[PDB]
Design a protein around this ligand. Sequence first.
Ligand code: ZN
Lengths: 350, 50, 397, 397, 397, 397
Amino acid sequence: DVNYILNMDRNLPSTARYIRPNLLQDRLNLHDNFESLWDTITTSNYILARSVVPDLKELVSTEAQIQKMSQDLQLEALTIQSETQFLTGINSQAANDCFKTLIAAMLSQRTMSLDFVTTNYMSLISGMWLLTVVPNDMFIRESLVACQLAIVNTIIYPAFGMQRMHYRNGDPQTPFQIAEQQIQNFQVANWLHFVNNNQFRQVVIDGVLNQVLNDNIRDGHVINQLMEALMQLSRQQFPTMPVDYKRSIQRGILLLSNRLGQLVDLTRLLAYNYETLMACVTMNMQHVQTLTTEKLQLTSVTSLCMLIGNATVIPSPQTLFHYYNVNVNFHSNYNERINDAVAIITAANR
Amino acid sequence: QQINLEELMRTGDYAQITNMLLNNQPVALVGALPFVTDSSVISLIAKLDA
Amino acid sequence: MDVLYSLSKTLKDARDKIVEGTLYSNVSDLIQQFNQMIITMNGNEFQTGGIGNLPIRNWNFDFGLLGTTLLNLDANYVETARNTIDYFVDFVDNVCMDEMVRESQRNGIAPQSDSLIKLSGIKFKRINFDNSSEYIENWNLQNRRQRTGFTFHKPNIFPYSASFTLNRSQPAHDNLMGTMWLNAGSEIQVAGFDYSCAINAPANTQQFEHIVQLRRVLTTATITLLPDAERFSFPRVITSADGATTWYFNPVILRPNNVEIEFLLNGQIINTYQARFGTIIARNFDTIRLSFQLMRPPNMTPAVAALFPNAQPFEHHATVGLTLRIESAVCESVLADASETMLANVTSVRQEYAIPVGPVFPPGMNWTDLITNYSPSREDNLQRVFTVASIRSMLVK
Amino acid sequence: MDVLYSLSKTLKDARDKIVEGTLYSNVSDLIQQFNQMIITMNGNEFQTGGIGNLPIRNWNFDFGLLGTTLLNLDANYVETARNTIDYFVDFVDNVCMDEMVRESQRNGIAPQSDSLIKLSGIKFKRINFDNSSEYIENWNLQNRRQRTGFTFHKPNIFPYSASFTLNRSQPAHDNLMGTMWLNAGSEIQVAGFDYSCAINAPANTQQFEHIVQLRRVLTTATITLLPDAERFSFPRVITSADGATTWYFNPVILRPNNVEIEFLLNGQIINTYQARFGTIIARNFDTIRLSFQLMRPPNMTPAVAALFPNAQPFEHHATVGLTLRIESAVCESVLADASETMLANVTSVRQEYAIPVGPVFPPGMNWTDLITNYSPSREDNLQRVFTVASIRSMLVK
Amino acid sequence: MDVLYSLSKTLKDARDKIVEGTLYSNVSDLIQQFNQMIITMNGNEFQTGGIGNLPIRNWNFDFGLLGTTLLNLDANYVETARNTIDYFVDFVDNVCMDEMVRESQRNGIAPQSDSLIKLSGIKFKRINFDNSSEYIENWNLQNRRQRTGFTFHKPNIFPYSASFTLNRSQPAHDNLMGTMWLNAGSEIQVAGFDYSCAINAPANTQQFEHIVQLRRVLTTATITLLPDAERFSFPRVITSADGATTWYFNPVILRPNNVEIEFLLNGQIINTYQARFGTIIARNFDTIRLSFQLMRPPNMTPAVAALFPNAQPFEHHATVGLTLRIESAVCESVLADASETMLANVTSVRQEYAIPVGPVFPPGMNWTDLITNYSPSREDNLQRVFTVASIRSMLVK
Amino acid sequence: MDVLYSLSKTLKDARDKIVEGTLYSNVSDLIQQFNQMIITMNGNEFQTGGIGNLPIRNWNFDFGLLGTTLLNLDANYVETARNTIDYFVDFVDNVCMDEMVRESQRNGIAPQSDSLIKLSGIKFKRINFDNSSEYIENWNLQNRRQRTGFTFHKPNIFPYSASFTLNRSQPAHDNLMGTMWLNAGSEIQVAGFDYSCAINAPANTQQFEHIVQLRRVLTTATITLLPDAERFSFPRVITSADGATTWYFNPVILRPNNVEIEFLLNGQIINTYQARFGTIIARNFDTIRLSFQLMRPPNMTPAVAALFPNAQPFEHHATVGLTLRIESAVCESVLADASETMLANVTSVRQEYAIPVGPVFPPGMNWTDLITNYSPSREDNLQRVFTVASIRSMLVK
Ligand SMILES: [Zn+2]
């Protein structure tokens, strides 16, 4: 990884000696029954992650943006349910949280939900961002349920004029999807298959035994996904219901688009970071439906989004190691005690 | 041969230079640079420049 | 259809560029394309076969993606991949074959099989890619209705025809005059004979002519034209025109006089060559006309004079001939030639699976019968069927 | 081995895509692959030659890499590159040639030379890439124990054989009956002659037959079958079977009667054609059987009647024949054909360097001898050697 | 020039990889290259035609670049693109043709047309890329001075030549001895005849020899050599050397004795084969020498003895012959062959547009005339013109 | 397939190393492997039989693991284990047999039965282990396409052939000269007889020769060669060649003179022995040629002289002979021999279950018919079928 410099400085006597780390894999498949404990690991592995994920920098002044926002937003225009789209603030934070939170989730192979807020449509738009990237694969089926339908209904379908039959779902297999088979606008149509796929391409065996469910080069920094997520948006501007509606909605959409030049940057960021950090994980990691969630307020999400500039941050060298080191030890302990354990038990029998 | 300095301090130097210097091989460098004038011939015979 | 194509170049450029070693970066652009496929497929269900001796096989899809992670490729990576490819190969084979047998009069151009009809569906179009395979290249250009074109070595434009025409004959067949020929594939041999050696002919010269009408225009043809027809330079006992008896042909060969070859297009002379033997170019033609003469030698040594008496019996039969071979040419319509295996592939798959004779193609895909009555329906079906054979040969030979 | 391949496509796609001007982002994916190589190599020593008149040149590695910057390429960039390529070219040439001469009874399918044996090493595998060259494509599919396959225009399946068989003869050789033929390359010509014109034969018909056993099965063959054997249609003076004297053959040609061609596979008829001249398909066969008859003409004009008396001397010898040519076919084993230069490349390199006759191949890589006794060892060595010739021709012709 | 090349592979790899449904990323590396072009072009204006019947059309550029709508292209994307391609196609065609007609003695290796001369300009070099098309591949390697090389099937190396040489003759032409032959394309047939059947010849053997000098060296040639010259195995009435009368040739064929074929290079024997019929390799030669003998049969059955009396008249003329065919070979110079359409393309474009005869090429691009006097100027012009024809055939067939 | 193997060595090394007593530690490594199996199986469902008289049987899996607890093994431990083994034994038997009957032309190498086809599945590969059983050992090495090899005692390479060839005969069969032989299994006996005792033969010596062409090459053969053919040393009444009558053979034996045995490979002499009786080594050959002579005794006691008169009747027939036996050899192809039960196992299972004749093997798995036409398909099927028989014999004899 070019960006990182390597060099040697001290020599080594033929006296040099170390002790094998011993990093056998799982040995114990807890992935298929000991839910209670996985939840506890995930949690752990998760916090661990946040501790690492670099804090962001150079953001757009909270005030400035939200202000051009009101100009664009046309907030108080009849609609009764005001001041629910602006509890967005504390972004100088929300983004940092939303950011960290997102990574660990992934790394730690955790699964979560969404402090969702139906009315606040914007908050939804951004949702579409989320699925555009984060492999829904690791999102308890349900929180995805709400999210999508909320999009699907209070959006697309009617403002796009299509199914004015809003949508009736009981419990098929992926409501977000199916929408595809019956949408007449390619742009819209690609989003659908890609999103309902991007299954977090769960297949990898690198640097010697490190199944770390990977992710699309595409996403990575081919990014386009974003460019396409936008282009599809660029032609959602039309009739059906009251005026203060399209006006408000589309205007918000545009804020995603313009910013899109930058939104790109986001993709790259994560792409790298996850793709980097990960490298130093010994513990394997099978995707599992944790028993516990993790609340992610579209609030923050939305912030991160239109609120990131030409910032650029990455894992401090020292930081990275520290990470390796830990998992390492831990492993060593697990494996070791295992041996210590077994040994006894077997003896215990004869 | 050559090696853009601008790209060097950018790239991070791959000991490419480090090696050549160590091993002594005819080479060149390029870009903005601080010159330094000397006189007392001596300096030269002594080959200070190396 | 175009869909189909991809499926292969996908696999080829796959079973080829993916191996124990290489860098990810060389396939990054590829890997993607691949996955994209798996997705579109998974969930869908298919059915191939059911006709003649062809087995019926059902296929389902539910496969994992590909590690877009790694830097280099480790052996293990391949094997887990090759296992997935082999199911698609064995698939396509069955897909091709199934659509390589069905024919259709009305619309003999579009897809037939339940397998392919489903592919032309819109939801799969998300797979097209790299159409540089000469055949598909031309398949498209024809949809957009534009100028196509293929390349052939020793093309197969002439339906087999071996016969004669007696311009002067009598019951005893002891003083004949006429021509005999063999048109087959890319070659024509024609001989003009005059038992009397033009003894009573004006200027002691007998004129001959051989016209061959191609069923399709050939352009940019490189042709070898040589004097003499070796095939008709030896003694023969031939059946009479009415099949009631047999005549004797005892040729002695003289150089063809005033040779003129015309390559015509719609009745117009496009190229004309006068007595030029060797390599000649015919740039665009649907007809070849060979005119040549037998001129009685004005001066003869005794040995020669003895062969040509003033009165019958005529025992040595003066013969002049020409040989013409089309080495290469371009045709806007698919044809069989001496290098491509398309005709053989289609014919072979049909024979192996005991496919019943259909309404379009002659029994056994007989080339002579096909080219003799090369109707629009036969050509559209042939092109569809040849294009599929070419898609199949990218993976299965 | 596969290793080797890369080395070239690397250089080709290199000496090709690296020109003064082009935009970098067209070679980004390429450049990489390249460097990767240099690395793996540097620090290694090789040696080629040592046999016959083949020089023993030594090689070492120690090279710098390539910039990655520059929107477009400046002349200077190329020249500093071309200089590095030329050392690899002149290298590979010597590598190919060195492994293109050695043969091994045992494992004639494995690497031989000190040069290559070292390449199959694991530490070099990090260089593999883009295996789409028809030959390597098939090299892999075989190493995995699977179904191979190649393409040939006018394949070379028949070892040269020109002879005759007298089924009825006598010292004077004045009333013979039998067949004579020429099997060579992709062609067969066979004639059946009966000096008596079946005068005393049952139904006045003489049956003939010619069987040719291929050393390898051919599939998907496009074949031209024509009546008559021009090669045996002229007067000849031939040596007797025992070489003690010479006989006279004075043919007169009649149409072959009841022509039947069978393409058999392991004794089973796979394809059969009755009197069908022109283009026919033989989809899978290891044997060709041509049966044809001479039927005495039941009705004869005086001129014909005069050739066939009731009693000897028989001065005009009734002859019927067939000509069969395999235009194209597929074979699971490598073969020489009329278009590929493989055999010629291998034979030429060995001749130029005065390579001594080895234990596997016949002197001079003689094709007839090779195909006549096409043992498994000769085939494995031939395939190895043909695949190397094809790798070499990507860079050096 | 190389410039030109790109222009096409650009369009091909374009009209090919750009279709309704492929993922953007499969063309990312491509798209770029494309745009880059449009830029460099726009603004500059061109003139094509202005000779014979060739129209003078004026081309001007004013185009918008290419979008990038994400995730597989939408139909609309294509059509707006195809519209731009079609102007370039119709362009290049006119560009090729315009430079495919001009010839120049002095410097007939460089660009002639106002159209191309402008392209060699530096400001355009920025386009060149993917030089893998066999012809351009060799165009470059020659500009730097190195070992070029092309591949041909049934190469066209022999200018048409059909004649005879009487080594012993007399006015009556009743006891001749000599040879007759046909050299054409890739084939040679030669017969040696002795009316006396070597009755008074030392050891009753008459020696024959046929030498053919190639105008260019052929390397790596795969050759078929067969005994007998069928073309000269039948009765003929031929014109005398002085054209004053005609002689009679009545051959009877015997096996050629002591056959020796030598493939020489600059007078040195490179390959020699003694009586080896079938497939032989000639690795590097500029001359072929065929030596063969007629040996009077020492033992003759009555029928044979009757053909060869001790005294004239000699009525059956003893003849021995050979047939040699070059199936494939490599030549450092461009040549016409039986598969490539280059000669036909160049000849066809010139004929269609009524291009006047120039100072370099023979009228009608006549192959025999061209190869007979294959001067350096004709070769440089031929190569330029063949390379352009090959660039054109990537898009227009 | 390899899968299958394990299943057994698992059970063998199981029903063997697991008994009332021993220490855990000796099986620790084993126990594991075992369990691992049960797991992979459980849940899955199978089906065997259905063809001919073979019963159809379904099997399910749901078994407990093994106490990895205990120190030593108590009787009770075994019995609870043996009960589980017996279900697998009775299983495998049915699995083997089911795949030991089906044959297949196209792909006669890969699995056939619904039972095995399911095993080659990836999810079961988690069971392979200890492949030291000579047969599987070679099964693998062949997949990786490498040099195989088996060991045989009195191999069965010669199809049964018992006949004679009369080089000199007459209706009365009172003065014959020729050879008679018996080629069968690993033995050859051949006798040369001359009723005239070479009375009128040049040097009073009659030459004989016997050539035997193996269908497969044998390497590292230990051979016994002895003078005399006991089988042809006694009086016989034999049928004439045309079956119309019977002749009398009354031999008297003389030592074979100038005995020369040649073991050839592709026409080349690899080993040659001149009059060497006893044990000789033939290291690599596909043909054996035995040449020997009968030399009339130059000096004869009265009793001997009386047997060989100067004139007929010839009542004592001089005979010389040789006996050759291949004691052991290695072959790259499976063969029947005098020690292995493979052929007998396969033949026996098919006979017991009344398996119908298939498309590959001759009726009754007849060895002579099989080895006479030992096609690639028969060999691949034979090897598959022999390897399965060997897997089965590890548990069931
Ligand atoms: Zn040819």
